[PDB]
Design a protein around this ligand. Structure first.
Ligand SMILES: [Fe+3]
Ligand SMILES: [Fe+3]
Ligand SMILES: [Fe+3]
Ligand SMILES: [Fe+3]
Ligand SMILES: [Hg+2]
Ligand SMILES: [Hg+2]
Ligand SMILES: [Hg+2]
Ligand SMILES: [Hg+2]
Ligand SMILES: [Hg+2]
Ligand SMILES: [Hg+2]
Ligand SMILES: [Hg+2]
Ligand SMILES: [Hg+2]
Ligand SMILES: [Hg+2]
Ligand SMILES: [Hg+2]
Ligand SMILES: [Hg+2]
Ligand SMILES: [Hg+2]
Ligand SMILES: [Hg+2]
Ligand SMILES: [Hg+2]
Lengths: 340, 340
């Protein structure tokens, strides 16, 4: 069913965002949704290369850090490297085979490309501060706690990729594959896309924002400046990445794009709620790992689930869900000097 | 099983380029083949935005152009837009699910991203010279001469993507899928990937350079200089894209990566000869439609035919194939100045 150039002259302004006919000519002169084209212009305007940032003094600062603080810093860096490794390849292998309008196709490619610049940033920081990089890169894959926090991210992507493969190969219906019946259903595939997309939104909206806080706390003490300059540039990109996912989900939820997608949003409302609360909870549980050997000036586990509670509430009402946490002002207003 | 984060701690230096474990950590501190790292570095240095090139006088020059020269100018541009539309998405959908070392994975995504910039520069040129872009864009999909010149490209990719889905889902073996026997072999998928790559090698190395010669012919008569600026930037990216496919193909042939690919390259050497002959022929048959309303003084079918002939021999030799055409000197040496 998938093709890299569908031979049908079709009207790309009238196609749904997903599961319509595959894009053939990449046009940018008109668009169903201007927002995706604007996010492409803005992300190209923000292009930056990690190597321009001097992180040489960070090697000295990290070495002087009080051990539990070296742990807080590198543990958070290791989790940041894991997320951007998944965000470099996955928008592309998971969403590109389903997009039917060109501007969202080129936005998903600009977004995945700015994710690999973030992964390149983390090699630039690690190699500069730790002298045997292999010690931190190999601990990403097997570290129990990084896997508990990231639990569930690969799963959503992988199930969507697998389901997409059945759909494109076999189409809808009940089929037999070696004695087993396999039912392919487009409604199910749309719920899977929807939940996947709400999970990417929770990843960029919440999961990165908790790590920015740990990086900028060091920056407030004039430590790890350098790492902070890079995390600032990354934070500016993520504001756009998050704008993109919020627009995609509000458009699907509003019924403006595919009527059936709005039905699915409403039916899936409780599972979205619980899934956001589980993402927040994983961040909280993580704070226990991070601050087990003691806290640092400006940040501890108490100020952190507070901040995760605050940021989850902001992101959840943005995508029209109900707030799970009791309303707060921002517990760490100093962070806005580094973010927005 | 395809996965976005393989749970196994693996030595990424010992994996093959293709069909080994899916990459989990995107690290850039070490590489099995540093040429892909050097190419990611080079491509990022060459970052350029189309929108910053002033193509306003091109509107006056194109207006002043005689009809048959407008035809030669727009047909060429319509085909280039079709190729980068396919090259923006197809590496990422077809190659990315099969790559096993991080440097090739990020080079394939930086390469695909530079193609969507080439697609975006063509919209910038088109929207500046024509009064309604849709008569250009809507003709591309339906132009039969464009689709005759293009035949082959979308199909190798879709076949490869299809075979990869059956392998990912079903695994190797002989299977019963809806009462039909479906055999999946990794050796046949390897051949498929290998010749997909030979084909990408032939579309980049040949089809693009023909289209460049037709663009710089106007520049040599001091017309279309804004378009000549963009095309010279695209050509500088294409030298990198071509080095990467010739290096992938030559490393697979050397038998230093996967031994079976070195066998595949030997066994399939005549199919690899034939698709280069077929591609060269597609390029010559285009000249009939390209100069159908009349030629230009230094640019006609015989000049385009011996240029295709000349560049096809240079390309085939660089990957160790036999030369099909009579050796000759460059029929249009003026192209050098524009290429470097
Ligand atoms: Fe990121
Ligand atoms: Fe992001
Ligand atoms: Fe290109
Ligand atoms: Fe190219
Ligand atoms: Hg997703
Ligand atoms: Hg997902
Ligand atoms: Hg934090
Ligand atoms: Hg943190
Ligand atoms: Hg940090
Ligand atoms: Hg939902
Ligand atoms: Hg929802
Ligand atoms: Hg959710
Ligand atoms: Hg290919
Ligand atoms: Hg191909
Ligand atoms: Hg030409
Ligand atoms: Hg060959
Ligand atoms: Hg070959
Ligand atoms: Hg000839």
């Amino acid at each position: 069913a998938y093709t890299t150039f569908s031979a049908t002259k079709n009207d790309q302004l009238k196609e749904p965002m997903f599961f319509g006919q595959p894009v053939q000519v990449a046009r940018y002169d008109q668009q169903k949704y201007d927002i995706f084209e604007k996010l492409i212009e803005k992300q190209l305007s923000f292009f930056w290369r990690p190597e321009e940032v001097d992180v040489s003094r960070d090697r000295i600062d990290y070495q002087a850090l009080p051990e539990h603080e070296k742990h807080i810093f590198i543990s958070n860096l290791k989790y940041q490297t894991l997320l951007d490794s998944i965000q470099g390849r996955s928008p592309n292998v998971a969403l590109l085979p389903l997009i039917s309008i060109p501007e969202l196709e080129t936005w998903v490619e600009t977004w995945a490309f700015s994710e690999t610049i973030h992964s390149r940033s983390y090699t630039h920081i690690i190699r500069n501060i730790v002298n045997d990089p292999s010690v931190v890169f190999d601990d990403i894959v097997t570290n129990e706690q990084i896997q508990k926090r990231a639990e569930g991210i690969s799963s959503y992507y992988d199930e969507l990729i697998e389901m997409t493969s059945y759909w494109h190969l076999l189409g809808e219906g009940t089929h037999t594959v070696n004695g087993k019946t396999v039912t392919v259903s487009l409604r199910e595939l749309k719920k899977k896309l929807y939940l996947c997309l709400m999970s990417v939104n929770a990843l960029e909206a919440i999961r990165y924002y908790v790590s920015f806080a740990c990086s900028f706390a060091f920056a407030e003490r004039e430590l790890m400046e350098g790492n902070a300059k890079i995390i600032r540039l990354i934070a500016r990109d993520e504001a756009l990445h998050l704008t993109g996912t919020q627009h995609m989900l509000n458009l699907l939820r509003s019924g403006a794009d595919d009527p059936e997608m709005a039905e699915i949003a409403e039916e899936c409302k409780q599972e979205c709620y619980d899934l956001f609360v589980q993402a927040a909870q994983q961040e909280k549980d993580w704070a226990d790992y991070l601050f087990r050997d003691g806290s640092m000036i400006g940040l501890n586990k108490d100020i952190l689930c507070q901040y995760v509670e605050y940021i989850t509430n902001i992101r959840m009402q943005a995508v029209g869900l109900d707030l799970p946490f009791n309303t707060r002002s921002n517990p760490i207003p100093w962070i806005n000097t580094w973010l927005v």
